[PDB]
Design a protein around this ligand. Structure first.
Ligand code: HEC
Ligand code: HEC
Lengths: 126, 126
Protein backbone atom coordinates (compact mmCIF):
# COMPACT_ATOMS: atom_id res chain seq x y z
CA UNK A 1 0.00 0.00 0.00
CA UNK A 2 3.07 2.30 -0.03
CA UNK A 3 3.99 4.38 -3.04
CA UNK A 4 7.61 4.75 -1.84
CA UNK A 5 9.64 3.18 0.97
CA UNK A 6 9.38 6.46 2.91
CA UNK A 7 5.63 5.90 3.11
CA UNK A 8 6.15 2.47 4.75
CA UNK A 9 8.56 4.07 7.23
CA UNK A 10 6.07 6.81 8.10
CA UNK A 11 3.32 4.20 8.58
CA UNK A 12 5.25 1.88 10.86
CA UNK A 13 6.59 4.76 12.96
CA UNK A 14 3.02 6.10 13.41
CA UNK A 15 1.84 2.61 14.39
CA UNK A 16 4.61 2.52 16.98
CA UNK A 17 3.58 5.96 18.28
CA UNK A 18 -0.01 4.82 18.77
CA UNK A 19 1.02 1.52 20.39
CA UNK A 20 3.27 3.40 22.83
CA UNK A 21 0.34 5.62 23.85
CA UNK A 22 -2.17 2.77 24.24
CA UNK A 23 0.33 0.58 26.12
CA UNK A 24 2.00 3.28 28.21
CA UNK A 25 -1.21 4.97 29.28
CA UNK A 26 -1.94 1.86 31.39
CA UNK A 27 1.26 2.16 33.45
CA UNK A 28 -0.44 4.17 36.26
CA UNK A 29 -3.24 1.59 36.41
CA UNK A 30 -0.84 -1.38 36.61
CA UNK A 31 1.08 0.45 39.36
CA UNK A 32 -2.09 1.28 41.29
CA UNK A 33 -1.55 5.03 41.01
CA UNK A 34 -4.74 5.36 38.91
CA UNK A 35 -7.95 3.42 39.52
CA UNK A 36 -8.73 0.13 37.78
CA UNK A 37 -11.95 0.11 35.79
CA UNK A 38 -12.20 -3.23 34.10
CA UNK A 39 -14.39 -2.02 31.22
CA UNK A 40 -12.10 0.92 30.44
CA UNK A 41 -9.06 -1.35 30.29
CA UNK A 42 -10.87 -4.00 28.28
CA UNK A 43 -11.72 -1.39 25.64
CA UNK A 44 -8.22 0.05 25.63
CA UNK A 45 -6.58 -3.35 25.23
CA UNK A 46 -8.95 -4.01 22.27
CA UNK A 47 -7.53 -0.90 20.61
CA UNK A 48 -3.98 -2.01 21.41
CA UNK A 49 -4.79 -5.51 19.96
CA UNK A 50 -5.75 -3.94 16.65
CA UNK A 51 -2.74 -1.62 16.55
CA UNK A 52 -0.32 -4.43 17.55
CA UNK A 53 -0.96 -6.29 14.29
CA UNK A 54 -0.21 -3.29 12.06
CA UNK A 55 3.54 -2.55 11.98
CA UNK A 56 4.73 -5.82 10.56
CA UNK A 57 3.22 -5.48 7.08
CA UNK A 58 5.06 -2.17 6.74
CA UNK A 59 8.47 -3.82 6.78
CA UNK A 60 7.81 -5.33 3.26
CA UNK A 61 9.90 -5.51 0.02
CA UNK A 62 12.14 -2.55 -0.46
CA UNK A 63 10.90 -0.63 2.60
CA UNK A 64 14.33 -0.23 4.21
CA UNK A 65 14.87 3.13 6.15
CA UNK A 66 14.09 4.95 9.30
CA UNK A 67 15.49 3.34 12.42
CA UNK A 68 14.83 -0.15 11.21
CA UNK A 69 18.10 -2.11 11.45
CA UNK A 70 19.04 -3.99 8.27
CA UNK A 71 18.99 -7.26 10.24
CA UNK A 72 15.17 -7.12 9.99
CA UNK A 73 14.99 -8.38 6.28
CA UNK A 74 18.05 -10.70 6.08
CA UNK A 75 16.89 -12.69 9.13
CA UNK A 76 13.22 -12.76 8.19
CA UNK A 77 12.37 -15.76 10.40
CA UNK A 78 14.03 -14.41 13.50
CA UNK A 79 12.25 -11.07 13.13
CA UNK A 80 8.94 -12.91 12.47
CA UNK A 81 9.34 -15.07 15.53
CA UNK A 82 9.69 -11.85 17.56
CA UNK A 83 6.58 -10.12 16.18
CA UNK A 84 4.51 -13.31 16.50
CA UNK A 85 5.71 -13.80 20.09
CA UNK A 86 4.92 -10.08 20.91
CA UNK A 87 1.42 -10.67 19.48
CA UNK A 88 1.18 -13.90 21.58
CA UNK A 89 1.92 -11.66 24.62
CA UNK A 90 -0.83 -9.28 23.37
CA UNK A 91 -3.28 -12.20 23.31
CA UNK A 92 -2.42 -12.93 26.94
CA UNK A 93 -2.96 -9.22 27.83
CA UNK A 94 -6.36 -9.35 26.05
CA UNK A 95 -7.26 -12.44 28.07
CA UNK A 96 -6.34 -10.71 31.34
CA UNK A 97 -8.28 -7.56 30.43
CA UNK A 98 -11.29 -9.50 29.13
CA UNK A 99 -11.38 -11.49 32.42
CA UNK A 100 -11.18 -8.26 34.47
CA UNK A 101 -8.26 -9.70 36.42
CA UNK A 102 -5.87 -6.94 37.65
CA UNK A 103 -3.15 -9.26 39.00
CA UNK A 104 -3.28 -11.06 35.68
CA UNK A 105 -3.19 -7.72 33.87
CA UNK A 106 -0.05 -6.61 35.78
CA UNK A 107 1.80 -9.76 34.85
CA UNK A 108 0.69 -9.74 31.20
CA UNK A 109 1.54 -6.03 30.89
CA UNK A 110 5.11 -6.70 32.03
CA UNK A 111 5.47 -9.53 29.52
CA UNK A 112 4.27 -7.31 26.67
CA UNK A 113 6.66 -4.53 27.66
CA UNK A 114 9.57 -6.99 27.73
CA UNK A 115 8.65 -8.14 24.20
CA UNK A 116 8.60 -4.58 22.86
CA UNK A 117 12.04 -3.95 24.37
CA UNK A 118 13.52 -7.25 23.17
CA UNK A 119 12.62 -6.43 19.60
CA UNK A 120 13.82 -2.82 19.78
CA UNK A 121 17.11 -3.95 21.34
CA UNK A 122 17.79 -6.34 18.42
CA UNK A 123 16.17 -4.52 15.47
CA UNK A 124 15.85 -0.77 16.09
CA UNK A 125 18.79 1.57 15.54
CA UNK A 126 20.08 3.50 18.43
CA UNK B 1 -3.13 10.07 28.46
CA UNK B 2 -0.79 12.87 27.28
CA UNK B 3 1.96 14.25 29.47
CA UNK B 4 2.17 17.47 27.42
CA UNK B 5 0.06 18.97 24.62
CA UNK B 6 2.79 18.02 22.14
CA UNK B 7 2.08 14.38 22.94
CA UNK B 8 -1.62 14.81 22.00
CA UNK B 9 -0.56 16.49 18.74
CA UNK B 10 1.83 13.64 17.90
CA UNK B 11 -0.91 11.09 18.65
CA UNK B 12 -3.63 12.67 16.54
CA UNK B 13 -1.27 13.27 13.61
CA UNK B 14 -0.19 9.59 13.73
CA UNK B 15 -3.85 8.52 13.82
CA UNK B 16 -4.44 10.66 10.74
CA UNK B 17 -1.44 9.08 9.00
CA UNK B 18 -2.77 5.58 9.61
CA UNK B 19 -6.32 6.51 8.56
CA UNK B 20 -4.98 8.01 5.31
CA UNK B 21 -3.16 4.75 4.55
CA UNK B 22 -6.10 2.47 5.37
CA UNK B 23 -8.58 4.67 3.49
CA UNK B 24 -6.38 5.62 0.53
CA UNK B 25 -5.09 2.12 -0.11
CA UNK B 26 -8.63 1.21 -1.27
CA UNK B 27 -8.70 3.85 -4.02
CA UNK B 28 -7.45 1.42 -6.74
CA UNK B 29 -10.09 -1.11 -5.67
CA UNK B 30 -12.95 1.43 -5.77
CA UNK B 31 -11.73 2.54 -9.22
CA UNK B 32 -11.47 -1.04 -10.50
CA UNK B 33 -7.75 -0.76 -11.17
CA UNK B 34 -7.05 -3.44 -8.51
CA UNK B 35 -9.18 -6.52 -7.93
CA UNK B 36 -12.00 -6.63 -5.39
CA UNK B 37 -11.67 -9.33 -2.75
CA UNK B 38 -14.54 -8.92 -0.37
CA UNK B 39 -12.77 -10.52 2.61
CA UNK B 40 -9.66 -8.38 2.18
CA UNK B 41 -11.73 -5.19 2.11
CA UNK B 42 -13.90 -6.30 5.02
CA UNK B 43 -10.78 -6.78 7.15
CA UNK B 44 -9.26 -3.49 6.04
CA UNK B 45 -12.42 -1.52 6.78
CA UNK B 46 -12.46 -3.12 10.28
CA UNK B 47 -9.00 -1.64 10.85
CA UNK B 48 -10.16 1.73 9.51
CA UNK B 49 -13.24 1.55 11.84
CA UNK B 50 -10.99 1.20 14.86
CA UNK B 51 -8.62 3.95 13.75
CA UNK B 52 -11.49 6.33 12.85
CA UNK B 53 -12.57 6.57 16.50
CA UNK B 54 -9.12 7.53 17.79
CA UNK B 55 -8.25 11.13 16.83
CA UNK B 56 -11.07 12.88 18.62
CA UNK B 57 -9.98 12.13 22.20
CA UNK B 58 -6.62 13.72 21.38
CA UNK B 59 -8.13 17.16 20.91
CA UNK B 60 -8.81 17.42 24.72
CA UNK B 61 -8.17 20.17 27.35
CA UNK B 62 -5.10 22.20 26.66
CA UNK B 63 -3.98 20.17 23.61
CA UNK B 64 -3.85 23.11 21.22
CA UNK B 65 -1.01 22.93 18.52
CA UNK B 66 0.01 21.34 15.31
CA UNK B 67 -2.24 22.16 12.38
CA UNK B 68 -5.37 22.07 14.44
CA UNK B 69 -7.22 25.37 13.88
CA UNK B 70 -8.29 27.14 17.09
CA UNK B 71 -11.92 26.94 15.95
CA UNK B 72 -11.86 23.26 17.03
CA UNK B 73 -12.23 23.99 20.87
CA UNK B 74 -14.33 27.22 20.86
CA UNK B 75 -17.01 25.59 18.66
CA UNK B 76 -16.99 22.23 20.42
CA UNK B 77 -20.44 21.18 19.17
CA UNK B 78 -19.79 22.01 15.55
CA UNK B 79 -16.51 20.07 15.59
CA UNK B 80 -18.26 17.16 17.38
CA UNK B 81 -21.05 17.06 14.86
CA UNK B 82 -18.38 16.68 12.14
CA UNK B 83 -16.49 13.81 13.80
CA UNK B 84 -19.73 12.00 14.66
CA UNK B 85 -21.00 12.43 11.08
CA UNK B 86 -17.59 11.18 9.68
CA UNK B 87 -17.95 8.13 11.98
CA UNK B 88 -21.59 7.71 10.74
CA UNK B 89 -20.08 7.58 7.20
CA UNK B 90 -17.57 4.98 8.50
CA UNK B 91 -20.47 2.85 9.76
CA UNK B 92 -21.99 2.97 6.28
CA UNK B 93 -18.61 1.93 4.75
CA UNK B 94 -18.44 -0.97 7.25
CA UNK B 95 -21.95 -2.03 6.21
CA UNK B 96 -20.98 -1.99 2.52
CA UNK B 97 -17.78 -3.94 3.15
CA UNK B 98 -19.46 -6.43 5.50
CA UNK B 99 -22.16 -7.06 2.83
CA UNK B 100 -19.48 -7.59 0.14
CA UNK B 101 -21.24 -5.04 -2.07
CA UNK B 102 -18.76 -3.22 -4.39
CA UNK B 103 -21.23 -0.67 -5.79
CA UNK B 104 -22.22 0.07 -2.22
CA UNK B 105 -18.56 0.27 -1.25
CA UNK B 106 -17.81 2.82 -4.03
CA UNK B 107 -20.60 5.09 -2.89
CA UNK B 108 -19.78 4.80 0.83
CA UNK B 109 -16.07 5.38 0.12
CA UNK B 110 -16.86 8.66 -1.64
CA UNK B 111 -19.02 9.80 1.27
CA UNK B 112 -16.25 9.06 3.76
CA UNK B 113 -13.69 10.93 1.67
CA UNK B 114 -16.00 13.95 1.48
CA UNK B 115 -16.34 13.92 5.28
CA UNK B 116 -12.57 13.86 5.79
CA UNK B 117 -12.19 16.83 3.42
CA UNK B 118 -15.07 18.81 4.94
CA UNK B 119 -13.48 18.64 8.36
CA UNK B 120 -9.98 19.46 7.12
CA UNK B 121 -11.33 22.42 5.13
CA UNK B 122 -12.96 23.91 8.27
CA UNK B 123 -10.56 22.82 11.04
CA UNK B 124 -7.06 22.07 9.71
CA UNK B 125 -4.56 24.84 9.04
CA UNK B 126 -3.31 25.30 5.59
C1 HEC C 1 9.70 -6.05 16.55
C2 HEC C 1 8.99 -7.38 16.50
C3 HEC C 1 9.04 -4.98 17.39
C4 HEC C 1 8.16 -5.07 18.41
C5 HEC C 1 7.59 -6.28 19.09
C6 HEC C 1 7.81 -3.71 18.80
N1 HEC C 1 8.48 -2.82 18.01
FE1 HEC C 1 8.34 -0.80 18.11
N2 HEC C 1 9.67 -0.64 16.57
C7 HEC C 1 10.28 -1.68 15.93
C8 HEC C 1 11.16 -1.18 14.90
C9 HEC C 1 12.02 -2.02 14.01
C10 HEC C 1 11.03 0.22 14.91
C11 HEC C 1 11.69 1.21 14.00
C12 HEC C 1 10.80 1.60 12.81
C13 HEC C 1 11.47 2.57 11.85
O1 HEC C 1 11.45 2.32 10.62
O2 HEC C 1 12.01 3.59 12.34
C14 HEC C 1 10.12 0.51 15.97
C15 HEC C 1 9.73 1.79 16.37
C16 HEC C 1 8.93 2.13 17.44
C17 HEC C 1 8.66 3.46 17.95
C18 HEC C 1 9.24 4.78 17.42
C19 HEC C 1 8.41 5.31 16.30
C20 HEC C 1 8.99 6.68 15.91
O3 HEC C 1 8.64 7.71 16.53
O4 HEC C 1 9.84 6.74 15.02
C21 HEC C 1 7.85 3.36 19.01
C22 HEC C 1 7.29 4.44 19.88
C23 HEC C 1 7.61 1.96 19.20
N3 HEC C 1 8.28 1.24 18.26
C24 HEC C 1 6.84 1.41 20.21
C25 HEC C 1 6.59 0.08 20.45
C26 HEC C 1 5.82 -0.45 21.55
C27 HEC C 1 5.17 0.40 22.61
C28 HEC C 1 5.82 -1.80 21.41
C29 HEC C 1 5.19 -2.88 22.27
C30 HEC C 1 3.74 -2.55 22.71
C31 HEC C 1 6.63 -2.12 20.25
N4 HEC C 1 7.09 -0.95 19.70
C32 HEC C 1 6.95 -3.38 19.82
C33 HEC C 1 10.10 -3.01 16.19
C34 HEC C 1 9.25 -3.55 17.15
C1 HEC D 1 -12.51 16.43 11.84
C2 HEC D 1 -13.82 15.86 12.34
C3 HEC D 1 -11.68 15.51 10.96
C4 HEC D 1 -12.03 14.44 10.22
C5 HEC D 1 -13.39 13.85 9.97
C6 HEC D 1 -10.82 13.91 9.63
N1 HEC D 1 -9.74 14.65 10.03
FE1 HEC D 1 -7.80 14.32 9.54
N2 HEC D 1 -7.26 15.94 10.65
C7 HEC D 1 -8.10 16.76 11.35
C8 HEC D 1 -7.35 17.79 12.01
C9 HEC D 1 -7.93 18.89 12.84
C10 HEC D 1 -5.99 17.55 11.73
C11 HEC D 1 -4.79 18.31 12.22
C12 HEC D 1 -4.17 17.66 13.47
C13 HEC D 1 -2.98 18.44 14.02
O1 HEC D 1 -2.94 18.71 15.24
O2 HEC D 1 -2.08 18.78 13.21
C14 HEC D 1 -5.98 16.40 10.87
C15 HEC D 1 -4.84 15.83 10.30
C16 HEC D 1 -4.78 14.79 9.40
C17 HEC D 1 -3.62 14.31 8.69
C18 HEC D 1 -2.19 14.88 8.77
C19 HEC D 1 -1.44 14.27 9.91
C20 HEC D 1 -0.01 14.80 9.85
O3 HEC D 1 0.85 14.23 9.12
O4 HEC D 1 0.29 15.81 10.48
C21 HEC D 1 -3.99 13.29 7.89
C22 HEC D 1 -3.15 12.47 6.96
C23 HEC D 1 -5.40 13.14 8.07
N3 HEC D 1 -5.86 14.06 8.96
C24 HEC D 1 -6.19 12.22 7.41
C25 HEC D 1 -7.55 12.04 7.53
C26 HEC D 1 -8.35 11.10 6.78
C27 HEC D 1 -7.79 10.16 5.74
C28 HEC D 1 -9.62 11.24 7.20
C29 HEC D 1 -10.89 10.53 6.77
C30 HEC D 1 -10.72 8.99 6.61
C31 HEC D 1 -9.64 12.30 8.18
N4 HEC D 1 -8.36 12.77 8.35
C32 HEC D 1 -10.75 12.82 8.80
C33 HEC D 1 -9.46 16.64 11.43
C34 HEC D 1 -10.23 15.64 10.84
Amino acid sequence: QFAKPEDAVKYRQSAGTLMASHFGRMTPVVKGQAPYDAAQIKANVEVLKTLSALPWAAFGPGTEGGDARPEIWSDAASFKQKQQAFQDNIVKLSAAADAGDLDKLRAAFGDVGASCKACHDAYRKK
